């Protein structure tokens, strides 16, 4: 029945002070305070019969003014063996869908459609079929020109998935976008699997559909299920990560969820919340020193 509480600061703005470790160690009453990475994450070993519903308060306030997360869990199980991970907007900075939108005139369009989508006010499956419409006739080298000239990697994420590979877990890139996108983006972060939508192409252009039936909000949640059956586990042993409302399903789902960077609605459905860190923010979350990364 043993809790724990982390503090994650971004790295770029390291704002863990030592002072601010041990003042949020003691606004809980704790005694051990544990550094996993010096001014950016600490472990606080709460005290028992302590219900995080406290802790995450007094942490919240202690801590208040200052771009510190707060994340109340049990010390044990803490480590997943599967991560499952959002794509876009989560392990890399674009919309795949907004990047396309640019090359046929309709960036800002296509971006509020998005927008409305990844906050939950449109099911993601008409959202899909209404944007990539407006992609008709653009011809096949339009993918890798956007994957090469506008697409970067969100800080953190070799770190994330290359450190998690090295204790022995799955990971899985799991996106609403495009097989063609998630296929370079994954091998190079340093995925064992990833899994998207289609595009449609007649050998040329694009066609402006997309292969049914689409993967959405539920096909997320499933190939999670596939996943953990197909490696001898249960979704408990995995954390699973993303900022829209498709990846509400699979947040919820899995052992550990965070909702990362989130959209306004999105954001305010889940549990576990990361608003200041990079992805690095997950590998403290699971427990890991800084002396167990992989650089
Ligand atoms: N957000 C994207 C895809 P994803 O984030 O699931 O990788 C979209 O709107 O199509
Ligand atoms: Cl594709
Ligand atoms: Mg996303």
């Known amino acids: 029945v043993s809790l724990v509480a982390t503090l994650i600061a971004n790295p770029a703005k390291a704002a863990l002070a030592p002072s601010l470790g041990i003042k949020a160690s003691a606004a809980v009453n704790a005694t051990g305070l544990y550094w996993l990475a010096d001014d950016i994450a600490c472990d606080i070993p709460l005290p028992l019969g302590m219900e995080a519903s406290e802790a995450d308060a007094s942490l919240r306030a202690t801590l208040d003014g200052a771009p510190i997360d707060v994340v109340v ?3 044990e199980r803490r480590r997943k063996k ?4 959002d794509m876009d907007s989560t392990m890399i900075g674009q919309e795949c869908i907004d990047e396309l939108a640019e090359e046929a005139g309709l960036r800002d369009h296509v971006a509020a459609i998005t927008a ?15 944007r990539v419409a407006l992609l008709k006739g653009l011809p096949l080298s339009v993918i890798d020109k956007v994957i090469s000239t506008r697409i970067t990697l969100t800080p953190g994420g070799p770190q994330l998935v290359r450190t998690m590979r090295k204790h022995g877990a799955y ?3 799991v996106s609403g976008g495009f097989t063609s996108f998630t296929r370079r983006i994954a091998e190079m972060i340093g995925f064992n699997e ?3 939508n289609r595009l449609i192409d007649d050998g040329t252009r694009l066609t402006g559909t997309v292969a049914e039936p689409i993967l959405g909000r539920e096909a997320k949640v499933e190939k999670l299920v596939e996943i953990a059956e197909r490696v001898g586990l249960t979704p ?8 829209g409302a498709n990846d509400l399903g699979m947040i ?5 969820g965070v909702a990362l960077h989130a959209k ?7 549990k576990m919340r990361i608003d200041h860190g990079d992805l690095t923010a997950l590998l403290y979350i699971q427990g890991y020193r800084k002396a167990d990364f992989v650089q």
């Open 73 to 75: 869990q049990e010390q």
């Open 82 to 85: 599967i991560l499952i991970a």
């Open 116 to 130: 409305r989508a990844m906050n939950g006010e449109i099911a993601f499956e008409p959202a899909l079929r209404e």
């Open 171 to 173: 990971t899985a890139l």
């Open 194 to 196: 990833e899994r998207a």
């Open 236 to 243: 408990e042993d995995a954390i699973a990560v993303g900022d």
């Open 252 to 256: 919820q789902l899995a052992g550990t």
């Open 264 to 270: 306004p609605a999105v954001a305010a459905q889940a």
